[PDB]
């Protein structure tokens, strides 16, 4: 709907790379994460089984393993990435209203929190689910489940290609923006 | 019925304590087994609650901890500390019919095996059980079950007590057979 011709004016103001590959890749997770993967993670909760009989045990152990969801995470990683191009927008449009190095220092500026979100969500994806290869069988021992309980999750091996794309992609997306850096640099 | 008029006979043919205090004793611990004891272990299986989904896991966990039930262990004991009796009735009646030493060896063998399947029994008691104390939970990891298991014994005060009971009478007898071996020791 709106989003492409919102996109096409940030598209009509960005540089070589800017307009046309870091745009593309923002676009190729947005369609990912929302026309296949957010259906994978659908009945995330309610197809993980527990082989107990103790009330409960199946809650805690879901919340212990995943304590946010892969597309949260995801969710969360695109707006974080997307704003420092929102603020940029606006902040132009807003001079432009009013109306080299006012825009330089922001642009350059702009492409630095997205590198350092970029690698913030990704480094909180393998710390948090210990690499990114998703298990079949965990064994949980949190209250109130007695001694330990086997308990599978639901599609381990649909998650982990989609997990495995989506990091794939982010980490293109940082190099990106480090050639991006650099072009920068040298103009000096 | 008829148990008691064979008892009467055997009766007529021992010595002092031998004839009362021992041979009440066994029929207390048959009435103990038969009339109380016989009806607290009748539901042992199917009050065993076991905290799992896996099949099979209860039929498992109920065989490793109770491989042999303790009234079949008192059933045995009991037959087994009254053949020797038996026998000696016989034989005696066996050298009635065809009419000091003879029956002194054999009265005297009659009560030594008497010892021995007392002693027996209340150690494999001891050992299969480990103690005369029944527990209310038994933690079970035997294939199939997944880790480890909770699983809760029926009536496990009821059973204490009347396992304290028969082990208790058990040991009286055993004193009462040694004190016969003495007196008749002494004889020379």
Redesign the interface.
């Given at each position: 709907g709106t989003l492409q011709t919102i996109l096409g004016g940030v598209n009509k103001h960005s540089t070589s790379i800017g307009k046309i590959w870091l745009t593309v890749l923002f676009i190729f997770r947005i369609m990912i994460l929302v026309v296949a993967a957010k259906e994978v993670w659908g009945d995330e909760q309610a197809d993980f089984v527990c082989?107990?009989?103790?009330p409960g045990c199946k809650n805690v152990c879901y919340d212990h393993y995943f304590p946010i969801s892969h597309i949260r995470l995801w969710a969360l990683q695109l707006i974080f990435v997307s704003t420092p191009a929102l603020l940029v927008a606006m902040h132009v449009a807003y001079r432009r209203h009013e109306k080299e190095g006012s825009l330089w220092w922001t642009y350059t500026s702009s492409i630095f929190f997205r590198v350092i979100f970029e690698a913030a969500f990704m480094y909180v994806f393998y710390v948090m689910y210990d690499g990114f290869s998703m298990q079949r069988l965990v064994?949980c021992n949190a209250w109130p489940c007695?001694?330990?309980?086997?308990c599978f999750v639901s599609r381990p091996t649909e998650k982990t290609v989609f997990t495995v794309f989506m990091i794939a992609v982010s980490g293109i997306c940082i190099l990106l923006n480090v050639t991006e850096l650099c072009y920068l640099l040298i103009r000096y």
């Amino acid at each position: 709907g709106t989003l492409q011709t919102i996109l096409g004016g940030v598209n009509k103001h960005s540089t070589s790379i800017g307009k046309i590959w870091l745009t593309v890749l923002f676009i190729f997770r947005i369609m990912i994460l929302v026309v296949a993967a957010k259906e994978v993670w659908g009945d995330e909760q309610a197809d993980f089984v527990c082989n107990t009989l103790q009330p409960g045990c199946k809650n805690v152990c879901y919340d212990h393993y995943f304590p946010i969801s892969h597309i949260r995470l995801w969710a969360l990683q695109l707006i974080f990435v997307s704003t420092p191009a929102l603020l940029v927008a606006m902040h132009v449009a807003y001079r432009r209203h009013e109306k080299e190095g006012s825009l330089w220092w922001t642009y350059t500026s702009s492409i630095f929190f997205r590198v350092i979100f970029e690698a913030a969500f990704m480094y909180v994806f393998y710390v948090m689910y210990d690499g990114f290869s998703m298990q079949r069988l965990v064994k949980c021992n949190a209250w109130p489940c007695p001694n330990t309980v086997d308990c599978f999750v639901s599609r381990p091996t649909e998650k982990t290609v989609f997990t495995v794309f989506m990091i794939a992609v982010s980490g293109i997306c940082i190099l990106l923006n480090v050639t991006e850096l650099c072009y920068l640099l040298i103009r000096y």
